[PDB]
Design an enzyme around this catalytic site. Structure first.
Site, PDB file in Angstrom:
ATOM      1  N   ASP C 349       5.567  11.151   2.364  1.00  0.00           N
ATOM      2  CA  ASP C 349       5.129   9.907   2.929  1.00  0.00           C
ATOM      3  C   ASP C 349       4.207   9.315   1.901  1.00  0.00           C
ATOM      4  O   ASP C 349       3.561  10.088   1.146  1.00  0.00           O
ATOM      5  CB  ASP C 349       4.472  10.169   4.271  1.00  0.00           C
ATOM      6  CG  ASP C 349       3.839   8.913   4.762  1.00  0.00           C
ATOM      7  OD1 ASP C 349       4.613   7.690   4.835  1.00  0.00           O
ATOM      8  OD2 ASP C 349       2.665   8.951   5.090  1.00  0.00           O
ATOM      9  N   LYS C 460     -10.425 -22.882   1.240  1.00  0.00           N
ATOM     10  CA  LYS C 460     -10.755 -21.460   1.251  1.00  0.00           C
ATOM     11  C   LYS C 460     -11.758 -21.052   0.182  1.00  0.00           C
ATOM     12  O   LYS C 460     -11.469 -21.105  -1.019  1.00  0.00           O
ATOM     13  CB  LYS C 460      -9.475 -20.635   1.104  1.00  0.00           C
ATOM     14  CG  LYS C 460      -9.669 -19.140   1.278  1.00  0.00           C
ATOM     15  CD  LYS C 460      -8.333 -18.413   1.224  1.00  0.00           C
ATOM     16  CE  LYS C 460      -8.505 -16.912   1.395  1.00  0.00           C
ATOM     17  NZ  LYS C 460      -9.291 -16.315   0.283  1.00  0.00           N
ATOM     18  N   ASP C 690       1.592  12.228   7.387  1.00  0.00           N
ATOM     19  CA  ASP C 690       0.311  12.194   8.091  1.00  0.00           C
ATOM     20  C   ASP C 690       0.317  11.368   9.373  1.00  0.00           C
ATOM     21  O   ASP C 690      -0.286  11.786  10.360  1.00  0.00           O
ATOM     22  CB  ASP C 690      -0.794  11.663   7.147  1.00  0.00           C
ATOM     23  CG  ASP C 690      -0.615  10.199   6.796  1.00  0.00           C
ATOM     24  OD1 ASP C 690       0.451   9.843   6.261  1.00  0.00           O
ATOM     25  OD2 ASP C 690      -1.540   9.402   7.057  1.00  0.00           O
ATOM     26  N   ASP C 694       5.731  10.045  11.004  1.00  0.00           N
ATOM     27  CA  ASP C 694       6.294  11.202  10.333  1.00  0.00           C
ATOM     28  C   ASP C 694       6.595  12.344  11.290  1.00  0.00           C
ATOM     29  O   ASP C 694       7.173  13.343  10.863  1.00  0.00           O
ATOM     30  CB  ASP C 694       5.347  11.694   9.234  1.00  0.00           C
ATOM     31  CG  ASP C 694       5.166  10.673   8.129  1.00  0.00           C
ATOM     32  OD1 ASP C 694       6.168  10.033   7.748  1.00  0.00           O
ATOM     33  OD2 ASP C 694       4.026  10.501   7.651  1.00  0.00           O
TER      34      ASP C 694
HETATM   35 MG   LIG Z   1       1.447   7.917   6.300  1.00  0.00          MG
END
Ligand SMILES: [Mg+2]
Ligand SMILES: C=C(/C=C\C[C@@H](O)[C@@H](O)[C@H](O)C/C=C/C=C\[C@@H](O)C[C@@H]1O[C@H](C[C@@H](O)[C@H](O)C[C@H]2O[C@H]([C@H](O)[C@H](O)CC[C@H](O)/C=C/[C@H](C)[C@@H](O)C[C@]3(O)O[C@H](C[C@@H](O)CCCCCCC[C@@]45C[C@@H](C)C[C@@](C)(O4)[C@@H](C[C@@H](C)CCCCC[C@@H](O)[C@H](O)[C@H](O)[C@@H](O)[C@H](O)[C@H]4O[C@H](C[C@H](O)[C@H](O)/C(C)=C/[C@H](O)C[C@@H](C)[C@H](O)C(=O)N/C=C/C(=O)NCCCO)[C@H](O)[C@@H](O)[C@@H]4O)O5)[C@H](O)[C@@H](O)[C@H]3O)C[C@@H](O)[C@@H]2O)[C@@H](O)[C@H](O)[C@H]1O)CC[C@H](O)[C@@H](O)[C@H](O)[C@H](C)C[C@H]1O[C@H](/C=C\[C@@H](O)[C@H](O)C[C@@H]2C[C@@H]3C[C@H](O2)[C@@H](CC[C@H]2O[C@H](CN)C[C@H]2O)O3)[C@@H](O)[C@H](O)[C@H]1O
Ligand SMILES: *[C@@H]1O[C@H](CO)[C@@H](O[C@@H]2O[C@H](CO)[C@@H](O)[C@H](O)[C@H]2NC(C)=O)[C@H](O)[C@H]1NC(C)=O
Ligand SMILES: CC(C)CCC[C@@H](C)[C@H]1CC[C@H]2[C@@H]3CC=C4C[C@@H](O)CC[C@]4(C)[C@H]3CC[C@]12C
Ligand SMILES: CC(C)CCC[C@@H](C)[C@H]1CC[C@H]2[C@@H]3CC=C4C[C@@H](O)CC[C@]4(C)[C@H]3CC[C@]12C
Ligand SMILES: *[C@@H]1O[C@H](CO)[C@@H](O)[C@H](O)[C@H]1NC(C)=O
Ligand SMILES: [Mg+2]
Lengths: 32, 291, 996
Positions: C349, C460, C690, C694
């Site tokens: 990941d 901005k 994590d 996943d």
């Molecule tokens: Mg992740």
């Protein structure tokens, strides 16, 4: 008479060897 | 899943052809070398020991008191009326006593005539080929009182009076020592010949002892034991046709239709016992004359 | 019909976000400003269920105990026991006094299985216990507006369709539909994987309910801003709730190590039953009865079941697992410690796993030079250059023109891992000044602020005017920051090497290319500028404006640029390199935008330099991408949008013809699909993740790796390996330990299987040649359950014979744990020599006592008879039952000692597979201890007072200990020359036939 074996001496020697080998192994595994 | 039969790579049972030859040849050579090494080591070990003396004998000391006829469970049961129920004991007794027949001890180069009364140990010498073959003390079959296979082939089973010939375990270089009369205060009343290893049969409990009846000991010179003039033994290599001392015990007047356990014990300094070995120095036989 | 429910959960989600405010309030029936009446809350709370995910299924404590008590190895032991134990039951109810040769054996095997189960349960229980002490989650209540009044109530008390107000710092309670936001930036890290905080806008933006900005998700924290929303989904009906439930309903599969154990049992039973049936034919050929033939068949199959191998294998795996636990590489599955060693494709990941999921200052542009600040987590990188005055100007603009700072408890915590209130960019700037320019606490108050202008939608800008610090006397400092293209326009002076210079296009375009360079690098750039207001034309005291801007918006002095991105973890690049060194294919699976995924992949090692994608080649040739050939591109970026419209065959084509693959914008379900595609090739897959996205990937994969702290609880529970320290290098350590333990498993198994030959052969020849028993059963138990325990265990502490991290991952269908070569060495050659040595000792003892080896043929008939007390030896002596039996027992004991003697050399030779014993060296202290303890234990089993009465193991005459010495020396020499020939002649017949 040849019909007698000193089993006590050999038995004692075996016990002594077992104790020594075991403590030596402990020394090698618990080495410092 | 079991189609390892064949393959496109010429496989049979799992491997190719030439591979089978290579592995089989390797295993043949390998196992042949292993067998050769084992036989060589066994040969050196054979060279270690001698031909007429075992390197260790403490496992046979003291000797054991064996009884003939040998019985499974040590029970001698039969019907005196039936001549078939006791044929097994008769066959075993005859087979063992055939080695003691009067005609077996013919030649003098092997059989030597020994005293009619027990004498001291006849030491033939040392354990070597220096003095070649050795003499064998003859043992007359008539020394057994009423069970000799000479007058009554049945040995007593015909009229309810069996005989159990007792024998001593052969031990190379063993010299039996009967107990001195000075220490004679434990074993029962028996004949005392300083040259006879005593043997006394009794019951086992308060019931067996009472129901036994009358014991009749038969032996060389009328002594209940083994004569010392037949020891020591020189092995099967030096004394091929050696005949050991024999002894007979007749149980006359035994309670019919009743199993009685009797124990015969050989006394002596060189004779020990054991709570685990029911045959070391003694033996047990439970007989039942169920007519 | 659960097979369809699982598929329904696998399907991507849909929503009703694209509805007018009137339409939304119509579908749910709720006021847009007052929410709902308090009575309306109990109408939904007790209707569908409190706002909380259904806890995972519970498996009672004793269930694991029974699981280990049954298993597959324990089942073979259970059946072996069953045969032996069922024999004594039939024997007890009939005869007067049986023997314990089979009853004791059956109970011993059963106790072995139960003991192994107890130990396994204790270890797995400790793993779960420590995991429970780490998952201490506390309730988080929501701010709900009901009856027009605000009230803070527990999250579980929230229902579907009631106005919820989320403040900057609060976690999104449930799935909300934004109706009014004020610059809210929710952190959709754990759910979608979007690293950069995504702003939430009440207006519908994208068709996808995830990429859209009018949807707040469960388990997402509101980084900044405030927002209002109507609850759409609750409890398990939420996005992450459905993902979690899908994870709980996935199949774990068969671990590679378990399949290897099963294959080993298959070969064990193969030789067992083969020898049993062949000896059945042999026994009948020897004219034995069918009753005895069946007895023999059963005895052969039973005697061929390794009892002590179960405990040795369990402790063997436990040792490596403990080594993993020492480095915070916890393994909930005892056999999952090896799975890493067989892995050949790691699907990782990006956000959270490879990166630190923390916006950090990466590069800075000052004095026309790019300065890369260290992006490590532990502050162990190369320090930037800080000696010029421009660095001071940039640090002042960053530390001063920033809304907030750290929090109350953020005092002892490290500068990086400490919490900061505000936007992620501000936190990165604060950390950069706190680590590179001293402190910002006293630096912010030293320059008193007067008027601050925050970010604006139109025109901005973000500026603020502060007072002068020391006696330099310019009297004012106006700092501003923003988009580089916007700040560049409102600037005229440029700071260079300390002095000022005009806005010449020569250096202005240098700044332009610097901005494009940092942008293409995968970072977020921000321009910083400041200006000294001349106190001679503008007062030194009070002179400012806010409605009709007075401060000069233009003519400012540009100082430099400050880029930032979530940087990868310290050891991530080196770890990816090591994994690729061992032959492991690194594939990135993330839900982040491809712009960031490609850069992170190039920075961590998933994409090396030189390898171009299908887009890079087209950009280098100024030609459409549809023209280039995909075979010319080694690496490729797979967009999640296109993956949705893909088939099962196309995925295989992508994985085969492409080495470096980067899957971007992939939903959790697509991650599972990718995992299945990787598994379709037949290669072992390991997923490292994590977030909750996943969980399906970490569950389906052969092994899931979760972050101890940076990982969500869902994917942490669905995984099989936890990294308490989050050190990604633990992946490298795990694969190394897996391959190492695999080799040591081969060695220990060979050591245990070699002892069965001299174990079964005595009984075999006892039946064959009708000779007195050479070896009893009690001695066999003293060998497999006694002496050999320590040597088999110590064989697990062995170390690499070569560079294990240099060879390719093992092939599941080619490289087996226990192959025919192992059986050929143990049962074929080594075991045979051990049996020969044992028989040598047997004949030596018997012949020395008067029973020559020749005379022992056919002696068993009357040797086992309990009443033939006149057995003649070769010397004519008559032996009673107990005398010859004492010799038999004192012969059995020496046979056991012989087994130990040959086991010395067997342990030494099995200690190494290819190298020489001297090249490896006996530095394994546990192994030397095993030899000493084994020898001492055997000597004790023979010379202890009362052994001939308790275990019928009589003392041995000293001269017997040297009977097996030549055999052990021969074994050592033979195996040594064998390994020497394999070393000097690789790939030869010796290796192809004896290398186990
Ligand atoms: Mg992740
Ligand atoms: C529970 C258990 C089981 C028993 C427990 C037991 O104790 C107790 O429960 C007792 O039972 C209690 C039960 C009580 C029951 C009742 C009681 O309550 C009541 C009382 O009982 C009392 C009795 C009791 O007192 C008695 O004593 C009980 C004892 O029983 C056992 C006996 O004493 C002893 O066993 C003797 C057995 C007996 O003799 C056998 C007889 C024959 C089977 C059979 O024939 C008899 C009979 O006929 O059976 C009939 C039944 C029939 O329906 C069955 C049908 C027949 C099927 C035919 C098919 C055959 C077949 C099959 C095909 C697949 C293949 C094929 C080839 O063969 C094929 C071919 C065809 C074509 C053949 C056709 C033939 C047909 C034949 C049939 O028809 C019949 O025979 C026929 O009907 C006959 O009737 C007829 O007469 C026939 O006669 C002829 C035929 C004959 C016959 O066929 C023959 C000879 C065949 C020959 O093979 C032919 C050969 C020559 C050959 O072919 C040949 O030519 N070769 C020529 C070679 C040649 O030229 N070479 C030339 C060379 C040139 O170079 C003729 O030809 C035919 O025509 C004719 O028809 O088809 C029927 O019943 C009757 O008829 C019957 O008579 C002993 C005990 O069981 C028991 O004490 C009574 O006295 C009392 O009054 C009563 O009240 C489990 C046991 C333990 O668990 C086990 O462990 C065991 O304990 C241990 C192993 C001990 C062992 O080891 C000990 C030492 C240590 C051990 O302790 C250790 O444990 C060892 C361990 C083991 C392992 C390994 C190691 O070591 C250790 C380590 C392991 C550990 O470490 C490991 C780590 N590595 C881990 C862990 O495992 O563990 C020692 C022990 O000694 C040893 O054993
Ligand atoms: C040995 O056998 C003879 C028989 O030839 C036994 O003769 C016994 O003689 C006595 C004395 O008169 C009688 O009381 C017995 O009844 C006879 N027995 C039998 C069976 O006929 C003789 O006793 C036996 N024993 C000895 C030691 O000589
Ligand atoms: C790595 C290998 C070669 C080590 C071999 C160890 C040898 C040297 C040791 C281990 C076991 C030992 C024996 C163990 C028990 C006894 C019985 C005792 O009453 C006398 C010594 C004697 C007979 C020992 C002799 C030496 C011996 C054989
Ligand atoms: C090719 C060469 C090296 C092999 C020579 C074989 C030697 C090493 C072997 C062959 C004969 C063996 C001896 C044969 C007999 C005995 C007596 C016994 O009570 C203990 C073992 C012992 C002491 C053996 C020790 C090893 C021995 C001497
Ligand atoms: C057996 O016979 C003898 C003969 O002398 C007699 O004295 C004895 O009492 C008898 N014993 C029994 C138990 O009948
Ligand atoms: Mg898993």
């Amino acid at each position: 008479d040849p019909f007698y074996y000193d089993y006590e001496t050999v038995r004692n020697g075996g016990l002594i060897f077992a104790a020594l080998a075991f403590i030596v192994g402990l020394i090698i595994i618990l080495s410092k | 899943k079991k189609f390892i039969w064949n393959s496109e790579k010429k496989e049979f049972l799992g491997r190719t052809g030439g591979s089978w030859f290579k592995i089989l040849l390797f295993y043949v050579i390998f196992y042949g070398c292993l067998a050769g090494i084992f036989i060589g080591t066994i040969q050196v070990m054979l060279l270690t020991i001698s031909e007429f003396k075992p390197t260790y004998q403490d496992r046979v000391a003291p000797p054991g008191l064996t009884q003939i006829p040998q019985s499974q469970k040590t029970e001698i049961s039969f019907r005196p009326n039936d001549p078939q129920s006791y044929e097994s004991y008769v066959v075993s007794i005859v087979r063992f006593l055939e080695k003691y027949k009067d005609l077996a001890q013919k030649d003098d180069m092997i059989f030597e005539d020994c005293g009619n009364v027990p004498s001291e140990l006849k030491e033939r010498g040392e354990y070597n080929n220096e003095r070649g073959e050795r003499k064998v003390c003859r043992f007359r079959l008539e020394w057994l009182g009423n069970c000799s296979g000479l007058n009554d082939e049945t040995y007593g089973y015909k009229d309810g009076k069996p005989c159990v010939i007792i024998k001593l375990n052969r031990v190379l270089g063993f010299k039996p020592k009967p107990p001195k009369n000075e220490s004679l205060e434990t074993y029962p009343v028996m004949k005392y010949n300083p040259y006879v290893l005593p043997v006394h049969c009794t019951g086992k409990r308060d019931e067996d002892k009472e129901k036994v009846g009358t014991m009749e000991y038969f032996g060389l010179g009328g002594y209940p034991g083994f004569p010392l003039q037949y020891y020591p033994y020189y092995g099967k290599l030096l004394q091929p046709k050696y005949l050991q001392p024999l002894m007979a015990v007749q149980f006359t007047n035994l309670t019919m239709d009743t199993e009685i356990r009797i124990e015969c014990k050989a006394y002596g300094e060189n004779i020990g016992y054991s709570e685990k070995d029911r045959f070391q120095g003694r033996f047990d036989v439970k007989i039942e004359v169920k007519s | 019909k659960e097979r369809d429910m699982d598929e329904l959960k696998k399907e991507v989600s849909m929503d009703d976000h694209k509805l007018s405010l009137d339409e939304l309030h119509r579908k749910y029936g709720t006021d847009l400003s007052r929410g709902l009446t308090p009575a309306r809350a109990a109408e939904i709370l007790a209707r569908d269920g409190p706002n909380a995910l259904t806890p995972p299924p519970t498996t009672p404590e004793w269930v694991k105990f029974c699981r280990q008590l049954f298993g597959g190895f324990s089942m073979l032991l259970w059946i072996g026991a069953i045969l032996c134990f069922l024999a004594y039951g039939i024997q007890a109810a009939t005869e007067e006094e049986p023997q314990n040769d089979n009853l004791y054996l059956g109970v011993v095997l059963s106790a072995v299985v139960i003991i192994t189960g107890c130990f396994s349960y204790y270890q797995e229980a400790k793993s779960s216990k420590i995991m429970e002490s780490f998952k201490n989650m506390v309730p988080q209540q929501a701010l709900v507006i009901r009856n027009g009044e605000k009230m803070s109530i527990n999250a579980e008390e929230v229902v579907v369709g009631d106005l919820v107000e989320v403040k900057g710092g609060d976690r999104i309670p449930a799935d909300l539909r934004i109706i009014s936001a004020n610059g809210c930036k929710v952190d959709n890290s754990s759910l979608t994987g979007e690293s950069e905080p995504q702003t939430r806008s009440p207006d519908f933006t994208n068709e996808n309910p995830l990429e859209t900005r009018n949807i707040a998700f469960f388990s997402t924290n509101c980084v900044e801003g405030t927002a209002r929303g109507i609850v759409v989904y609750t409890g398990d009906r939420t996005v992450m709730g459905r993902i979690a439930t899908l994870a709980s309903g996935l199949e774990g599969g068969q671990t590679p190590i378990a399949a290897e154990i099963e294959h080993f049992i298959h070969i064990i039973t193969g030789v067992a039953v083969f020898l049993g049936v062949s000896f059945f034919i042999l026994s009948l050929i020897l004219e034995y009865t069918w009753l005895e033939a069946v007895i023999f068949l059963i005895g052969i199959i039973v005697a061929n079941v390794p009892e002590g191998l179960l405990a040795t294998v369990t402790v063997c795996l436990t040792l490596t697992a403990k080594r993993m636990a020492r480095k915070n590489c916890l393994v909930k599955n005892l056999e999952a410690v090896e799975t890493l060693g067989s892995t050949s494709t790691i699907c990782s990941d990006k956000t959270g796993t490879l990166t630190q999921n923390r916006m950090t200052v990466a590069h800075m542009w000052f004095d026309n030079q790019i300065h890369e600040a260290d992006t490590t987590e532990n502050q162990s990188g190369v320090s930037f250059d800080k000696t010029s005055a421009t660095w001071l100007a940039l640090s002042r603009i960053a530390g001063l023109c920033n809304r907030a700072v750290f929090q109350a408890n953020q005092e002892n915590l490290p500068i990086l891992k400490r919490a900061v209130a505000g936007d992620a960019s501000e936190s990165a700037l604060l950390k950069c000044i706190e680590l590179c320019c001293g402190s910002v606490k006293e630096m912010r108050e030293r320059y008193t602020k007067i008027v601050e202008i925050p970010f604006n939608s139109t025109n901005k800008y973000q500026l603020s005017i502060h007072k002068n610090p020391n006696t330099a006397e310019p009297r004012h400092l106006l700092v501003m920051k923003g988009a580089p293209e916007r700040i560049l326009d409102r600037c005229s002076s440029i700071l260079i090497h300390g002095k000022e210079q005009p806005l010449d296009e020569e250096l202005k375009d240098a700044f332009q290319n610097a901005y494009l360079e940092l942008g293409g690098l995968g970072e977020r750039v921000l321009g910083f500028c400041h200006l000294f207001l001349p106190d001679e034309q503008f007062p030194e005291g009070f002179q400012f404006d806010t409605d009709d801007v007075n401060f000069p918006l233009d003519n400012l002095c540009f100082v430099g640029l400050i880029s930032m991105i979530d940087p990868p973890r310290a050891a991530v690049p080196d770890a990816v390199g090591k994994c690729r060194s061992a032959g492991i294919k690194v594939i990135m699976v993330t839900g982040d935008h491809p712009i960031t995924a490609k850069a992170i992949a190039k920075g961590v090692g998933i994409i090396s330099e030189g390898n171009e994608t299908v887009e890079d080649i087209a950009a280098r040739l100024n030609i459409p991408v549809s023209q280039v050939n995909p075979r010319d591109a080694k690496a490729c970026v797979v967009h999640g949008s296109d993956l949705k419209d893909m088939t099962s065959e196309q995925l295989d084509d992508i994985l085969k013809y492409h080495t470096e693959i980067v899957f971007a914008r992939t939903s959790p379900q697509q991650k599972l699909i990718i995992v299945e595609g990787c598994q379709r090739q037949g290669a072992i897959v390991a997923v490292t993740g994590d977030g909750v996205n996943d969980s399906p990937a970490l569950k389906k994969a052969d092994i899931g790796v979760a972050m101890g702290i940076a990982g969500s609880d869902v994917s942490k529970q669905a995984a099989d390996m936890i990294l308490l320290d989050d050190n990604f290098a633990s992946i490298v350590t795990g694969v190394e330990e897996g391959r190492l333990i695999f080799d040591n498993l081969k060695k220990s198994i060979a050591y245990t299987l070699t002892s069965n030959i001299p174990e079964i052969t005595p009984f075999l020849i006892f039946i064959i040649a009708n000779i007195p028993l050479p070896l009893g059963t009690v001695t066999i138990l003293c060998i497999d359950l006694g002496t050999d325990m320590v040597p088999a265990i110590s064989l697990a502490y062995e170390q690499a014979e070569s560079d294990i991290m240099k060879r390719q991952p093992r092939n599941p269908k080619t490289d087996k744990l226990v192959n025919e070569r192992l059986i050929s060495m143990a049962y074929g050659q080594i075991g045979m020599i051990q049996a020969l040595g044992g028989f040598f000792t047997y004949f030596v003892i018997l012949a020395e006592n008067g029973f020559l080896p020749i005379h022992l043929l056919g002696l068993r008939v009357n040797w086992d008879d309990r009443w033939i007390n006149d057995v003649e030896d070769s010397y004519g002596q008559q032996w009673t039952y107990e005398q010859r039996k004492i010799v038999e027992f004192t012969c059995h004991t020496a046979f056991f000692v012989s087994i130990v003697v040959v086991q010395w050399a067997d342990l030494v030779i099995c200690k190494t597979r290819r190298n020489s014993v001297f090249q490896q060296g006996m530095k394994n202290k546990i192994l030397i201890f095993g030899l000493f303890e084994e020898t001492a234990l055997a000597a004790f089993l023979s010379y202890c007072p009362g052994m001939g009465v308790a275990l019928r193991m009589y003392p041995l005459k000293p001269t017997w200990w040297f009977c097996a010495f030549p055999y052990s020396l021969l074994i050592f020499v033979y195996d040594e020359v064998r390994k020497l020939i394999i070393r000097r002649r690789p790939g030869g017949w010796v290796e192809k036939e004896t290398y186990y």
